[PDB]
From a paper:
Cephalosporins are members of the β-lactam family of antibiotics. These drugs achieve their bactericidal potency by irreversibly inhibiting penicillin-binding proteins (PBPs), particularly the transpeptidase (TPase) PBPs that cross-link cell wall peptidoglycan. A recent study found PBP1 and PBP2 are essential for vegetative growth in R20291, while SpoVD and PBP3 are essential for sporogenesis.
Next, we determined the structures of PBP3 and SpoVD, at 2.40 Å and 2.20 Å resolution. Like PBP2, the four residues in the Zn2+-binding motif of C. difficile PBP3 and SpoVD consist of an invariant His, a Cys from the X residue of the SXN motif, and two electron rich residues—in this case Cys instead of Asp. The significance of the Asp → Cys substitution between SpoVD/PBP3 and PBP2 is unclear.
Residue numbers in the entry:
A (entry chain A): 56 to 189, 209 to 585
B (entry chain B): 55 to 186, 210 to 408, 414 to 585
Write the structure that this text describes.
Amino acid sequence: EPKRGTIYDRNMKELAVSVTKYTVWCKPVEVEDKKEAAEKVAEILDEDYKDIYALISKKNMALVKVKRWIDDDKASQIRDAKLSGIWVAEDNQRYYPYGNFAPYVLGHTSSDATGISGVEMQYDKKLKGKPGKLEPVQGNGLVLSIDEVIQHYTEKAVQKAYELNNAKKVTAIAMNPKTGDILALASKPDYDPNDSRTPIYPYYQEELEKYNDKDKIKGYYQMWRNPAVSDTYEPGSTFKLITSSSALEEGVIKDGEKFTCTGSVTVGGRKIKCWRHYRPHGTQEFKQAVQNSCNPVFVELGSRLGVGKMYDYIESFGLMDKTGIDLPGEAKGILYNEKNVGPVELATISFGQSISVTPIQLITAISSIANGGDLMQPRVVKSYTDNKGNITETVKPKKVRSVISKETSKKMLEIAESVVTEGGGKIAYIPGYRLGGKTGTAQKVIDGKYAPGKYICSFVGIAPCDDPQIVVLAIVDEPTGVSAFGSTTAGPIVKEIMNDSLKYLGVKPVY
Amino acid sequence: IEPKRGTIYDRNMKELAVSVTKYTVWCKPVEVEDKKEAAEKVAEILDEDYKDIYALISKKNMALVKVKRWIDDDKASQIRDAKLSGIWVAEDNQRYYPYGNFAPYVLGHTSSDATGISGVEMQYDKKLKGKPPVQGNGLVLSIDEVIQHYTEKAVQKAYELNNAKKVTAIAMNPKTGDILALASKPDYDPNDSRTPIYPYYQEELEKYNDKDKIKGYYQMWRNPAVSDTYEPGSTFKLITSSSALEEGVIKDGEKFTCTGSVTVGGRKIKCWRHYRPHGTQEFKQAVQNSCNPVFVELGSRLGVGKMYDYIESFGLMDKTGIDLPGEAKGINVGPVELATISFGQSISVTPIQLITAISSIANGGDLMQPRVVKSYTDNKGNITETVKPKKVRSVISKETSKKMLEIAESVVTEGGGKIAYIPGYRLGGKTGTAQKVIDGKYAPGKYICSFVGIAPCDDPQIVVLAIVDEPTGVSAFGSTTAGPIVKEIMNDSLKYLGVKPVY
Ligand SMILES: *C(=O)[C@@H](NC(=O)[C@H](N)c1ccccc1)[C@@H]1N[C@@H](C(=O)O)C(C)(C)S1
Ligand SMILES: *C(=O)[C@@H](NC(=O)[C@H](N)c1ccccc1)[C@@H]1N[C@@H](C(=O)O)C(C)(C)S1
Ligand SMILES: [Zn+2]
Ligand SMILES: [Zn+2]
């Protein structure tokens, strides 16, 4: 079996490496004195007698693995023990040196070192070594766009929010909007790629004993599923950045136009309420309606666009199609067919309800607003290496299309900054770093229906808005026992990741 | 009449800088006998505000007033044909750069009185100036406009891709010391030398009060390739290696062992790749893997004495004497400084010093004076004199030169330079990554990445130094940032130079 190629972060830190280890094997029948062998092996390996005894006493199993991937020192003690029916064999370990880290990027391999999830699978052929015969050649390596420092800050912020919000799931993606490079992708609960079948979060512990042995592979695939690329969700008010960009690009907002909030608008015989319908926003300039997250104003902009223009921009921002991200099992969101869209559906779409997207779709779309209107193909793999760590080839950023003009982009970045300085994203304000973004709080869809007390809260951030270098999307899925708002659950995630990442990146503060 | 300057040509006699005859409208106010009637006519012809023209011709206290500068020949004979007593037109030559925003750090530009204030325009101001009208003598640059276009294109692409503070590339003919190309982004347009054409310069000029704007101008105009110093990083291992081999301190088939670190006194210098040490290495392989411990050992075997002699001999302590203005001269810790110096840290050079040093390795060991001016012409475009290639000294033997060219090729075929590999073209070179020295202190997340290429290594015809200064949002390594710049320039330039592929 040949070693797989090494997977590096963008600073050439090893994230996944094939290392030559030794495994302790046993044929029970060939073991003369089982208590004696168990005690010798147990002492060498530093394991409890009763556990090693239970392994080498096994019935009807002709060949038993006693312990995988022991170091050379302990493997030499086993050999030199000269025990019967007990031996050591060379065994390639697929080792992930940062452990419970970036599992939904890296993925993992089966027993035979075949990639079965994440980058390990997507680039299985590129990573595979060339076999030897009774010497093997290590496979070519990969350099990710992922930065282990930003990934750490992302994992840390997401793990904190998961505990604090007692959430079903917390997910964050950090993107370079200029290139579409993923800097970080974290979701909790997650798994350790060093031990892909051992749940390390109670949630997955409880989910794996709702399956019999025959069907446990289904529970494993559930735990290995990348929520950033495979799950869909109604994005809430973050989609108001899409509606705003579309409205400004189409010229449907007059300069100095005042929009009046009375707390509701009637469409299709239904009242669509402002969140603050008890205390109407009254007269608003457009900037102030985004700051206020005033639903009726977005209903009006949706109507001025109509179903056709609205669906053109949704398609153009990439929200009806896979992003083409180089990870396995991407979904493509859920949207009502354009020609069956009624007035109430159109009105809700205008503020991000009755449309489902992946997190990757939504961050990719928002990144085009932060990149002069250019939609980029997201990617995780930036470069290929030989088996000695030498770069052989690097991948160019791919511009898919211009969604909006440079002028609309600049106006939107000025509006996004004002949401964080003057509006509903104030919680995420960092002095000197010109953070912009938008919050969402959306009732959760389960089996095509809106369930009660179950929300998805999100915040998308862009920094710095004068020259965007990082976009962060954080999603808190079903926060429990807390103020369930985008600002209070997800805003602190984006603020922490932005604060730590911009200082790591050396972004100069401007006060 | 300030006479026409000499024309500046590329080496294929394409015009890069030429004086063109325009016309200026003059007034002697005490002879405009019918002022606002005379100023109504001139206002239309020149299309002026009817007031701005009157205001100028009705000046009580001036013997001569310039009405409008650099007007076209139609309007010149229109003004002559109106035969007003106090108003005429005179010739007035304008400097034009037909390629516009192209090799601005080589060409430079002039002030309104046709005096050169940067680049070749200033360095050769005397040679270019006309007789007071006889047009001045012209220059033929070593610059090739085709290779310059390949260099500008590669450097602009890298500037955008890497969101860098700056990208700089020099192409040199190692046999002659001739500069084939010198480009840097951001740069400026010598046709309009005070209007920033890059956001970066738009920002840096707005930081000065209008009164103090000159420090801003001279910052936009500064040629980073001759005036800016930097820490070369591992490209310096080509100097250290050449020096080691020339002194003979490397034994034939000697093996060097990497275990992630060395001990050069109590202080232990570690390798850059101590996570997976390189193990046992032929010298070739130490250079391919850029193994720091090996170059420390080589440094120790030379001593401070011989190291500093070789550095000086390669010209790295002295100006090159390139014929451009404002060249930087450039910038204690015992065996520890000696150790770090061995791979290009705590040592600062200009890009022109470094490419000149590497060029001597690629030219059988002959250090050459670099030059941008190959020939002089008359005022009619005939060549009168060619500047001879000037050897400064032999730094190493043809033997050491051949060994170093074999190693340089192996860096690109087998080692850290693989990104730049072109089938048939025998490229060699070395990557560098350094932390940026600012006012003497290393920063955080601030790297200068570089790649020096030599091709073909069996008969070198071109050396290219590419430097990406502060790449942003991307992996900061010589190979990924600077390697594609050299590859692109080498690919386009070797075909144009008519280098035959050998498979
Ligand atoms: C966008 O997400 C909007 N959300 C809604 O209108 C929901 N139907 C809602 C959920 C919870 C409470 C009230 C309404 C606006 N943006 C939200 C946010 O920015 O957090 C909001 C709650 C301010 S309303
Ligand atoms: C030569 O430039 C060396 N560079 C360094 O030792 C820097 N201190 C460094 C920068 C980034 C990461 C680790 C160390 C060696 N040559 C470089 C190159 O060829 O680009 C290198 C990164 C392989 S280390
Ligand atoms: Zn409202
Ligand atoms: Zn080493």
